[model samples]
Target: MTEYKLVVVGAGGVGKSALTIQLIQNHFVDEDSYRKQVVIDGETCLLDILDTAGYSAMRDQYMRTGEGFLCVFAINNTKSFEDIHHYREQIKRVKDSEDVPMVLVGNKSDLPSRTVDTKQAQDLARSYGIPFIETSAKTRQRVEDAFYTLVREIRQYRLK
Candidate 1:
């Protein structure tokens, strides 16, 4: 089993926890007060999921010190999509990593009622020169692939 420390960072209610649940459990859970340390596979990921709370607030204070990040943004909400620049700025200006692995996520694809055009998302990702994919936790669409994609990228980065 491989070990990877992945932190799902985003403002509250952008489906950060939902994405984590979908990645870890292949299910969608909508709740904020929920807390658990679940072991999905024999890999022993020891996932420390953050949310809106005092502990999460403390964690947020130190998020800048993180070694790497999984910067997530959602479609339908163009503002969130645009906010990825802020994350990039922080990672570059603060963490100062020129080679940090990041997967530009356009979450919430299941909601066709509020979908952002795929071309716009793809163009943005291309501008950043990072891989991008749209995903949905409800349909379990491309969820696993996105995670594996990140893992593969991280592994390739290490090999370099």
Candidate 2:
């Protein structure tokens, strides 16, 4: 079994916890914390997910332990979307690698009002050579897809 340290981060209300809950428990949680083992690609992978509330005092500490990252943002919050740049830089600085395994996630797709467009998010992810996924934690759309995508990327990266 392979153990991977994953981190989920976004601005406080961007639904980082929501996505985590949906992926691990298949339901939305008011307050969910996760550190679970999940099977990916027929491999028993123990995923230690650190769910962050946007900015943290120990952010650098957390960044250093991460093998993969899910940088999430809300579609309706432009600031949260823009904050991905900071998260990307932190990972590069901590991991000392520009090619870190990460995914740019735009959450809250179920909301009728969206400020950040999908194409814009995709373009940003492209700049970092990472995959972009849109998800709705409430509706449970593409929640697992984002996680599986990141897991596959992390596995492939380790093989290289």
Candidate 3:
């Protein structure tokens, strides 16, 4: 089995932790590190998930080593949504690649209403030429897809 080092990054309170936790636990929830075994496209792969919450001191280190990243934001939070640009900038800057493996994630979909429009999120992903997903950690919506999609992106990146 192969392994992919995946990082969850975004502004504080964007539910990056909750997204990562939801993947492994299938429940809403941490600075948590997890090793997950998942089957994507019929291949068993190990996912090294790091929820980089309050751990900016070690950010560049993780960005350098991470094979893929979930650039997360909260649909209900306007500032958090804009902060995604910073995360995208830093990850690519550290990777020294314009097209590194990445995904634009809009989290907190369970909120009653969203400050960030779905169209804007999709537009951002299209501009970055990356995949986009809206996830609700509380309801376990698209939680696994976020991680698995990154794995798929890593595969495609390695191929091309």
Candidate 4:
């Protein structure tokens, strides 16, 4: 069986757990500390699903664990957008690898009035030289796609 570990991180209310729950179980989680694992398409895609309170506090741990990262920068919040820099640096520091795939997810796309502009998000992703996707936990939008995207990236990394 293919195995992949991933870290789902964002600001406290940026829907980290919600998204994780959606991916692993196709549902929403009511609490931050809640965690569980489920097989997706027969692959043991073990999701670490860390609820990093802010970019600063859990930076080191994020760096040290897992194979790659699913960085959810909520479009509803500007700081979440800006915090991707810190997340990237921390990943570099902890993983100490130049070629790890870091997929940027602009979550909370279900809310239109609170969006942070698609062009800006794409620019940020382009600046970092990473793949990007805007998603929603409420609508289960791209929740599975995000995980599967990571799966493909992990497979590519393994072949390298």
- Can you give the lDDT of residue 23 in candidate 4? 70
Clashing pairs in 1: none
Lowest lDDT block of 10, candidate 3: 51-60
Clashes of each: 0, 0, 0, 0
**Cα lDDT tens digits for candidate 1, 1-160:** 3455555665545677787788666788764322234333333333343333215455545455443456677777777777778767766665456677777878788776565688987897788777887888777788766666665566667787
Model 1 regions more than 4 Å off = 31-68
For 37-85, candidate 3 gives per-residue lDDT tens digits of 8787889988899888625557889999999999999998889888888
Q: Rate the local accuracy (lDDT) of all candidates.
A: 0.64, 0.88, 0.88, 0.74
Better of 1 and 2 by lDDT: 2
Higher-ranked by TM-score: 1 or 2: 2
Provide the global lDDT of candidate 4 against the true structure.
0.74
Best of the candidates, TM-score:
3
Stretches off by above 4 angstroms in model 4 are 30-48, 55-59
Ranking by lDDT: 2, 3, 4, 1
Return the candidate ranking by TM-score, descending. 3, 2, 4, 1
Query: What does candidate 2 score in Cα RMSD to the true structure?
Result: 1.7
- lDDT per residue (tens digit) for residues 18-50 in model 4: 787787677765544334444656666445555
TM-score of each: 0.75, 0.93, 0.95, 0.82
Better of 3 and 4 by TM-score: 3
